[PDB]
Amino acid sequence: XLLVTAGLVLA
Amino acid sequence: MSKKDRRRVFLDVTIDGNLAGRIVMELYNDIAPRTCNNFLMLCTGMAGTGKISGKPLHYKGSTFHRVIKNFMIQGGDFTKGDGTGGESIYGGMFDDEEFVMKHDEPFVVSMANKGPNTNGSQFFITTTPAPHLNNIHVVFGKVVSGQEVVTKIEYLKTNSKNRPLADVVILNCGELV
């Protein structure tokens, strides 16, 4: 999807 | 608050070695002093070495490892280059300042993280309103020049993990005094 993370990337 | 206290920084980008232009951002130290100080110290790299990382606290040489069309571009991971690294100047990670600014406009600069108080060095620049990020990510600055370089980077062809096929490098960075 649309998130901005550092390590556990989601859709 | 003092607009006078707001500093300016830049990111000179290259795509597969070719000059792509400069991104100039205005940091809001009057609204996110701790966060903005991190960003600027990281552009100039004058903060030394990572207490935990060991590698230099400097965006210079790092890349924009993840890009999503119609959304944002992410980079700043100067310790792993894959999105699992990065480190603030304060040693390790630091806390989330008041979520005063929102992603209600395109081209604002924000901190990428992995949950509450997990601000490292990784940041993103949006190219569209991203309200679903409000209160979860700290917005510290805004692009005032070169938003076309961002658009250029955002629409680059990517692999299945959204990494640009080409090497997008922050060939240089610093402050505009």
mmCIF file of all heavy atoms in Angstrom, chain B residues 18-60:
data_model
loop_
_atom_site.group_PDB
_atom_site.id
_atom_site.type_symbol
_atom_site.label_atom_id
_atom_site.label_comp_id
_atom_site.label_asym_id
_atom_site.label_seq_id
_atom_site.Cartn_x
_atom_site.Cartn_y
_atom_site.Cartn_z
ATOM 1 N N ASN B 18 24.127 10.620 -14.145
ATOM 2 C CA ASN B 18 23.683 11.831 -14.819
ATOM 3 C C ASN B 18 23.053 12.831 -13.865
ATOM 4 O O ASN B 18 22.251 12.464 -13.006
ATOM 5 C CB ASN B 18 22.702 11.466 -15.931
ATOM 6 C CG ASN B 18 23.332 10.571 -16.980
ATOM 7 O OD1 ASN B 18 24.344 10.930 -17.596
ATOM 8 N ND2 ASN B 18 22.743 9.395 -17.186
ATOM 9 N N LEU B 19 23.420 14.098 -14.022
ATOM 10 C CA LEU B 19 22.902 15.155 -13.163
ATOM 11 C C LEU B 19 21.400 15.280 -13.349
ATOM 12 O O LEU B 19 20.928 15.407 -14.476
ATOM 13 C CB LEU B 19 23.580 16.481 -13.500
ATOM 14 C CG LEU B 19 25.109 16.440 -13.602
ATOM 15 C CD1 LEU B 19 25.632 17.836 -13.885
ATOM 16 C CD2 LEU B 19 25.707 15.893 -12.320
ATOM 17 N N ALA B 20 20.654 15.251 -12.245
ATOM 18 C CA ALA B 20 19.199 15.340 -12.289
ATOM 19 C C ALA B 20 18.640 16.641 -11.732
ATOM 20 O O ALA B 20 17.441 16.907 -11.850
ATOM 21 C CB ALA B 20 18.588 14.164 -11.542
ATOM 22 N N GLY B 21 19.499 17.449 -11.119
ATOM 23 C CA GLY B 21 19.035 18.708 -10.565
ATOM 24 C C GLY B 21 19.203 18.795 -9.061
ATOM 25 O O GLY B 21 19.653 17.843 -8.421
ATOM 26 N N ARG B 22 18.845 19.946 -8.500
ATOM 27 C CA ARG B 22 18.956 20.172 -7.066
ATOM 28 C C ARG B 22 17.598 20.357 -6.381
ATOM 29 O O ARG B 22 16.689 21.014 -6.914
ATOM 30 C CB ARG B 22 19.841 21.400 -6.793
ATOM 31 C CG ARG B 22 19.703 21.984 -5.383
ATOM 32 C CD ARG B 22 20.688 23.133 -5.136
ATOM 33 N NE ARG B 22 22.071 22.662 -5.183
ATOM 34 C CZ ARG B 22 23.142 23.410 -4.923
ATOM 35 N NH1 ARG B 22 23.013 24.688 -4.594
ATOM 36 N NH2 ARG B 22 24.353 22.872 -4.983
ATOM 37 N N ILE B 23 17.470 19.763 -5.199
ATOM 38 C CA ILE B 23 16.248 19.879 -4.407
ATOM 39 C C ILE B 23 16.602 20.808 -3.246
ATOM 40 O O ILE B 23 17.540 20.535 -2.493
ATOM 41 C CB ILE B 23 15.804 18.513 -3.817
ATOM 42 C CG1 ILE B 23 15.716 17.460 -4.925
ATOM 43 C CG2 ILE B 23 14.469 18.677 -3.077
ATOM 44 C CD1 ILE B 23 15.436 16.047 -4.408
ATOM 45 N N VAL B 24 15.874 21.908 -3.115
ATOM 46 C CA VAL B 24 16.128 22.859 -2.041
ATOM 47 C C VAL B 24 14.943 22.818 -1.097
ATOM 48 O O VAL B 24 13.800 23.029 -1.518
ATOM 49 C CB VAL B 24 16.289 24.314 -2.575
ATOM 50 C CG1 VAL B 24 16.476 25.282 -1.406
ATOM 51 C CG2 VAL B 24 17.471 24.399 -3.525
ATOM 52 N N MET B 25 15.217 22.558 0.178
ATOM 53 C CA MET B 25 14.161 22.476 1.175
ATOM 54 C C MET B 25 14.273 23.515 2.278
ATOM 55 O O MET B 25 15.374 23.912 2.671
ATOM 56 C CB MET B 25 14.171 21.095 1.823
ATOM 57 C CG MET B 25 13.876 19.955 0.882
ATOM 58 S SD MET B 25 14.268 18.403 1.678
ATOM 59 C CE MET B 25 15.907 18.073 0.984
ATOM 60 N N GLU B 26 13.123 23.953 2.778
ATOM 61 C CA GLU B 26 13.093 24.898 3.881
ATOM 62 C C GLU B 26 12.658 24.125 5.111
ATOM 63 O O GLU B 26 11.543 23.600 5.161
ATOM 64 C CB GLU B 26 12.106 26.033 3.627
ATOM 65 C CG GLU B 26 11.825 26.848 4.881
ATOM 66 C CD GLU B 26 11.310 28.242 4.578
ATOM 67 O OE1 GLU B 26 12.036 29.007 3.892
ATOM 68 O OE2 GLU B 26 10.188 28.569 5.033
ATOM 69 N N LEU B 27 13.548 24.042 6.093
ATOM 70 C CA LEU B 27 13.255 23.333 7.327
ATOM 71 C C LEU B 27 12.540 24.269 8.279
ATOM 72 O O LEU B 27 12.796 25.474 8.278
ATOM 73 C CB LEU B 27 14.549 22.834 7.955
ATOM 74 C CG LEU B 27 15.389 21.996 6.991
ATOM 75 C CD1 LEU B 27 16.710 21.602 7.634
ATOM 76 C CD2 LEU B 27 14.583 20.777 6.581
ATOM 77 N N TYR B 28 11.639 23.721 9.088
ATOM 78 C CA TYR B 28 10.884 24.529 10.041
ATOM 79 C C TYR B 28 11.371 24.321 11.468
ATOM 80 O O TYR B 28 10.728 23.632 12.260
ATOM 81 C CB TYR B 28 9.390 24.205 9.954
ATOM 82 C CG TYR B 28 8.734 24.634 8.659
ATOM 83 C CD1 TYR B 28 9.375 24.469 7.431
ATOM 84 C CD2 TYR B 28 7.460 25.203 8.661
ATOM 85 C CE1 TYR B 28 8.762 24.859 6.241
ATOM 86 C CE2 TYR B 28 6.841 25.597 7.478
ATOM 87 C CZ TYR B 28 7.495 25.422 6.275
ATOM 88 O OH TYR B 28 6.874 25.810 5.109
ATOM 89 N N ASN B 29 12.499 24.945 11.792
ATOM 90 C CA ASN B 29 13.109 24.833 13.116
ATOM 91 C C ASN B 29 12.267 25.479 14.210
ATOM 92 O O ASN B 29 12.464 25.218 15.398
ATOM 93 C CB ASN B 29 14.497 25.463 13.069
ATOM 94 C CG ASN B 29 15.242 25.094 11.805
ATOM 95 O OD1 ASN B 29 14.716 25.263 10.701
ATOM 96 N ND2 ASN B 29 16.462 24.585 11.952
ATOM 97 N N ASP B 30 11.329 26.325 13.800
ATOM 98 C CA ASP B 30 10.440 27.008 14.730
ATOM 99 C C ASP B 30 9.278 26.106 15.125
ATOM 100 O O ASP B 30 8.507 26.439 16.028
ATOM 101 C CB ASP B 30 9.875 28.271 14.080
ATOM 102 C CG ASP B 30 9.240 27.994 12.716
ATOM 103 O OD1 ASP B 30 9.407 26.873 12.193
ATOM 104 O OD2 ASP B 30 8.578 28.894 12.158
ATOM 105 N N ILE B 31 9.149 24.967 14.447
ATOM 106 C CA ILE B 31 8.046 24.044 14.713
ATOM 107 C C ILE B 31 8.524 22.627 15.020
ATOM 108 O O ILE B 31 7.790 21.819 15.590
ATOM 109 C CB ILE B 31 7.089 23.996 13.495
ATOM 110 C CG1 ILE B 31 6.586 25.404 13.177
ATOM 111 C CG2 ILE B 31 5.914 23.077 13.781
ATOM 112 C CD1 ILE B 31 5.876 25.518 11.852
ATOM 113 N N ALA B 32 9.758 22.333 14.629
ATOM 114 C CA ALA B 32 10.346 21.020 14.843
ATOM 115 C C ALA B 32 11.861 21.209 14.921
ATOM 116 O O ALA B 32 12.619 20.643 14.133
ATOM 117 C CB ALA B 32 9.974 20.093 13.689
ATOM 118 N N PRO B 33 12.315 22.009 15.900
ATOM 119 C CA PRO B 33 13.731 22.323 16.135
ATOM 120 C C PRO B 33 14.653 21.122 16.273
ATOM 121 O O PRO B 33 15.760 21.115 15.728
ATOM 122 C CB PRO B 33 13.687 23.169 17.404
ATOM 123 C CG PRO B 33 12.483 22.599 18.139
ATOM 124 C CD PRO B 33 11.482 22.490 17.021
ATOM 125 N N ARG B 34 14.206 20.106 16.999
ATOM 126 C CA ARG B 34 15.025 18.923 17.197
ATOM 127 C C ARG B 34 15.150 18.121 15.917
ATOM 128 O O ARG B 34 16.229 17.640 15.579
ATOM 129 C CB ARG B 34 14.426 18.039 18.288
ATOM 130 C CG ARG B 34 14.493 18.627 19.688
ATOM 131 C CD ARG B 34 15.573 17.932 20.475
ATOM 132 N NE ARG B 34 15.288 16.507 20.611
ATOM 133 C CZ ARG B 34 16.213 15.587 20.848
ATOM 134 N NH1 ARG B 34 17.490 15.940 20.947
ATOM 135 N NH2 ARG B 34 15.868 14.313 20.967
ATOM 136 N N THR B 35 14.043 17.984 15.199
ATOM 137 C CA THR B 35 14.037 17.212 13.965
ATOM 138 C C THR B 35 14.823 17.889 12.845
ATOM 139 O O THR B 35 15.656 17.256 12.180
ATOM 140 C CB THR B 35 12.598 16.961 13.501
ATOM 141 O OG1 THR B 35 11.869 16.331 14.564
ATOM 142 C CG2 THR B 35 12.585 16.060 12.264
ATOM 143 N N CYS B 36 14.555 19.174 12.641
ATOM 144 C CA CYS B 36 15.242 19.929 11.612
ATOM 145 C C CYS B 36 16.750 19.984 11.851
ATOM 146 O O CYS B 36 17.541 19.945 10.903
ATOM 147 C CB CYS B 36 14.688 21.347 11.547
ATOM 148 S SG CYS B 36 12.974 21.435 11.019
ATOM 149 N N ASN B 37 17.155 20.074 13.114
ATOM 150 C CA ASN B 37 18.573 20.143 13.421
ATOM 151 C C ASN B 37 19.238 18.851 12.974
ATOM 152 O O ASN B 37 20.383 18.847 12.502
ATOM 153 C CB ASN B 37 18.781 20.353 14.919
ATOM 154 C CG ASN B 37 20.195 20.812 15.254
ATOM 155 O OD1 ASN B 37 20.653 21.865 14.786
ATOM 156 N ND2 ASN B 37 20.894 20.023 16.067
ATOM 157 N N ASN B 38 18.509 17.751 13.112
ATOM 158 C CA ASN B 38 19.041 16.455 12.715
ATOM 159 C C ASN B 38 19.297 16.454 11.221
ATOM 160 O O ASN B 38 20.384 16.107 10.760
ATOM 161 C CB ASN B 38 18.057 15.338 13.057
ATOM 162 C CG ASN B 38 18.621 13.961 12.763
ATOM 163 O OD1 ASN B 38 19.647 13.568 13.318
ATOM 164 N ND2 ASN B 38 17.952 13.220 11.886
ATOM 165 N N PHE B 39 18.280 16.863 10.470
ATOM 166 C CA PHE B 39 18.366 16.900 9.021
ATOM 167 C C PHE B 39 19.532 17.742 8.499
ATOM 168 O O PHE B 39 20.331 17.270 7.677
ATOM 169 C CB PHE B 39 17.059 17.418 8.431
ATOM 170 C CG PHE B 39 16.887 17.071 6.991
ATOM 171 C CD1 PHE B 39 16.537 15.777 6.619
ATOM 172 C CD2 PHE B 39 17.141 18.010 6.000
ATOM 173 C CE1 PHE B 39 16.445 15.422 5.282
ATOM 174 C CE2 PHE B 39 17.054 17.667 4.659
ATOM 175 C CZ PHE B 39 16.706 16.371 4.296
ATOM 176 N N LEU B 40 19.631 18.982 8.980
ATOM 177 C CA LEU B 40 20.694 19.889 8.549
ATOM 178 C C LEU B 40 22.073 19.358 8.927
ATOM 179 O O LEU B 40 22.997 19.390 8.117
ATOM 180 C CB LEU B 40 20.480 21.288 9.144
ATOM 181 C CG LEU B 40 21.421 22.394 8.654
ATOM 182 C CD1 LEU B 40 20.771 23.752 8.806
ATOM 183 C CD2 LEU B 40 22.716 22.327 9.435
ATOM 184 N N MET B 41 22.219 18.868 10.153
ATOM 185 C CA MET B 41 23.506 18.327 10.569
ATOM 186 C C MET B 41 23.860 17.123 9.703
ATOM 187 O O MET B 41 25.036 16.821 9.497
ATOM 188 C CB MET B 41 23.479 17.926 12.049
ATOM 189 C CG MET B 41 23.531 19.108 13.023
ATOM 190 S SD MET B 41 24.897 20.280 12.687
ATOM 191 C CE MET B 41 26.358 19.227 12.928
ATOM 192 N N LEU B 42 22.845 16.439 9.185
ATOM 193 C CA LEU B 42 23.092 15.277 8.341
ATOM 194 C C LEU B 42 23.446 15.671 6.908
ATOM 195 O O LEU B 42 24.160 14.936 6.217
ATOM 196 C CB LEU B 42 21.884 14.340 8.348
ATOM 197 C CG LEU B 42 21.692 13.532 9.631
ATOM 198 C CD1 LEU B 42 20.517 12.581 9.453
ATOM 199 C CD2 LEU B 42 22.950 12.753 9.936
ATOM 200 N N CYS B 43 22.948 16.824 6.461
ATOM 201 C CA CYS B 43 23.266 17.287 5.117
ATOM 202 C C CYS B 43 24.718 17.783 5.128
ATOM 203 O O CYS B 43 25.492 17.469 4.227
ATOM 204 C CB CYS B 43 22.319 18.414 4.673
ATOM 205 S SG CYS B 43 20.604 17.907 4.273
ATOM 206 N N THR B 44 25.097 18.530 6.160
ATOM 207 C CA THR B 44 26.460 19.046 6.236
ATOM 208 C C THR B 44 27.426 18.028 6.820
ATOM 209 O O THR B 44 28.638 18.177 6.681
ATOM 210 C CB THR B 44 26.551 20.319 7.086
ATOM 211 O OG1 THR B 44 26.305 19.994 8.460
ATOM 212 C CG2 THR B 44 25.534 21.348 6.606
ATOM 213 N N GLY B 45 26.883 17.000 7.468
ATOM 214 C CA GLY B 45 27.710 15.959 8.060
ATOM 215 C C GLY B 45 28.659 16.439 9.144
ATOM 216 O O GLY B 45 29.576 15.726 9.539
ATOM 217 N N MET B 46 28.431 17.649 9.633
ATOM 218 C CA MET B 46 29.283 18.227 10.662
ATOM 219 C C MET B 46 29.055 17.669 12.056
ATOM 220 O O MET B 46 29.650 18.151 13.017
ATOM 221 C CB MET B 46 29.108 19.750 10.687
ATOM 222 C CG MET B 46 29.684 20.445 9.455
ATOM 223 S SD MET B 46 31.455 20.093 9.256
ATOM 224 C CE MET B 46 31.435 18.646 8.148
ATOM 225 N N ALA B 47 28.203 16.654 12.174
ATOM 226 C CA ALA B 47 27.920 16.062 13.481
ATOM 227 C C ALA B 47 28.833 14.886 13.811
ATOM 228 O O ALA B 47 28.665 14.240 14.841
ATOM 229 C CB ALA B 47 26.461 15.632 13.567
ATOM 230 N N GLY B 48 29.781 14.593 12.929
ATOM 231 C CA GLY B 48 30.723 13.521 13.207
ATOM 232 C C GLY B 48 30.439 12.093 12.785
ATOM 233 O O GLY B 48 30.195 11.807 11.615
ATOM 234 N N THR B 49 30.493 11.188 13.756
ATOM 235 C CA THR B 49 30.281 9.767 13.513
ATOM 236 C C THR B 49 29.171 9.156 14.360
ATOM 237 O O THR B 49 28.948 9.561 15.503
ATOM 238 C CB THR B 49 31.584 8.997 13.769
ATOM 239 O OG1 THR B 49 32.518 9.296 12.725
ATOM 240 C CG2 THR B 49 31.336 7.508 13.814
ATOM 241 N N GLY B 50 28.475 8.176 13.788
ATOM 242 C CA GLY B 50 27.402 7.513 14.506
ATOM 243 C C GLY B 50 27.891 6.764 15.737
ATOM 244 O O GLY B 50 28.767 5.893 15.648
ATOM 245 N N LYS B 51 27.317 7.107 16.891
ATOM 246 C CA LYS B 51 27.678 6.481 18.163
ATOM 247 C C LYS B 51 27.453 4.972 18.125
ATOM 248 O O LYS B 51 28.190 4.210 18.748
ATOM 249 C CB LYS B 51 26.849 7.093 19.294
ATOM 250 C CG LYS B 51 27.092 6.483 20.662
ATOM 251 C CD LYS B 51 26.190 7.124 21.703
ATOM 252 C CE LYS B 51 26.383 6.495 23.070
ATOM 253 N NZ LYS B 51 25.489 7.112 24.089
ATOM 254 N N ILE B 52 26.430 4.556 17.384
ATOM 255 C CA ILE B 52 26.074 3.149 17.237
ATOM 256 C C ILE B 52 26.516 2.593 15.883
ATOM 257 O O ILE B 52 27.122 1.521 15.809
ATOM 258 C CB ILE B 52 24.541 2.956 17.381
ATOM 259 C CG1 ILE B 52 24.116 3.293 18.815
ATOM 260 C CG2 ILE B 52 24.147 1.537 16.991
ATOM 261 C CD1 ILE B 52 22.628 3.142 19.093
ATOM 262 N N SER B 53 26.207 3.331 14.816
ATOM 263 C CA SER B 53 26.554 2.929 13.449
ATOM 264 C C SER B 53 28.055 2.845 13.261
ATOM 265 O O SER B 53 28.590 1.811 12.859
ATOM 266 C CB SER B 53 26.005 3.940 12.439
ATOM 267 O OG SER B 53 24.633 4.197 12.657
ATOM 268 N N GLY B 54 28.724 3.954 13.553
ATOM 269 C CA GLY B 54 30.158 4.025 13.389
ATOM 270 C C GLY B 54 30.436 4.743 12.085
ATOM 271 O O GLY B 54 31.440 5.447 11.943
ATOM 272 N N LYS B 55 29.531 4.567 11.130
ATOM 273 C CA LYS B 55 29.667 5.200 9.827
ATOM 274 C C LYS B 55 29.338 6.689 9.947
ATOM 275 O O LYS B 55 28.650 7.112 10.871
ATOM 276 C CB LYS B 55 28.743 4.503 8.824
ATOM 277 C CG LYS B 55 28.971 2.985 8.775
ATOM 278 C CD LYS B 55 28.079 2.276 7.764
ATOM 279 C CE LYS B 55 28.372 0.775 7.740
ATOM 280 N NZ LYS B 55 27.639 0.067 6.650
ATOM 281 N N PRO B 56 29.847 7.510 9.023
ATOM 282 C CA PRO B 56 29.559 8.942 9.112
ATOM 283 C C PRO B 56 28.101 9.383 8.984
ATOM 284 O O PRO B 56 27.357 8.934 8.109
ATOM 285 C CB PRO B 56 30.465 9.547 8.034
ATOM 286 C CG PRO B 56 30.690 8.430 7.078
ATOM 287 C CD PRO B 56 30.846 7.236 7.977
ATOM 288 N N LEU B 57 27.710 10.271 9.893
ATOM 289 C CA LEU B 57 26.371 10.850 9.929
ATOM 290 C C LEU B 57 26.310 11.867 8.791
ATOM 291 O O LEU B 57 26.423 13.072 9.018
ATOM 292 C CB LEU B 57 26.163 11.558 11.270
ATOM 293 C CG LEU B 57 26.219 10.659 12.508
ATOM 294 C CD1 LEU B 57 26.594 11.467 13.742
ATOM 295 C CD2 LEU B 57 24.868 9.987 12.691
ATOM 296 N N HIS B 58 26.122 11.378 7.569
ATOM 297 C CA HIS B 58 26.097 12.250 6.395
ATOM 298 C C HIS B 58 25.261 11.640 5.274
ATOM 299 O O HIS B 58 25.528 10.506 4.853
ATOM 300 C CB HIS B 58 27.533 12.437 5.890
ATOM 301 C CG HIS B 58 27.746 13.679 5.082
ATOM 302 N ND1 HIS B 58 28.955 13.976 4.490
ATOM 303 C CD2 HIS B 58 26.932 14.731 4.825
ATOM 304 C CE1 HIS B 58 28.878 15.161 3.908
ATOM 305 N NE2 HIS B 58 27.662 15.641 4.097
ATOM 306 N N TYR B 59 24.268 12.381 4.781
ATOM 307 C CA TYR B 59 23.436 11.882 3.684
ATOM 308 C C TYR B 59 24.261 11.716 2.416
ATOM 309 O O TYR B 59 23.960 10.867 1.574
ATOM 310 C CB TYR B 59 22.302 12.841 3.373
ATOM 311 C CG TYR B 59 21.195 12.857 4.379
ATOM 312 C CD1 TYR B 59 20.711 14.063 4.874
ATOM 313 C CD2 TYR B 59 20.584 11.675 4.794
ATOM 314 C CE1 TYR B 59 19.647 14.105 5.746
ATOM 315 C CE2 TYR B 59 19.504 11.702 5.680
ATOM 316 C CZ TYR B 59 19.045 12.927 6.144
ATOM 317 O OH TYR B 59 17.968 12.990 6.979
ATOM 318 N N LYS B 60 25.297 12.540 2.290
ATOM 319 C CA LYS B 60 26.185 12.522 1.131
ATOM 320 C C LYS B 60 26.654 11.117 0.787
ATOM 321 O O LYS B 60 27.363 10.473 1.570
ATOM 322 C CB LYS B 60 27.398 13.413 1.389
ATOM 323 C CG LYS B 60 28.328 13.564 0.213
ATOM 324 C CD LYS B 60 29.438 14.549 0.540
ATOM 325 C CE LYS B 60 30.372 14.725 -0.637
ATOM 326 N NZ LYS B 60 30.832 13.417 -1.179
#
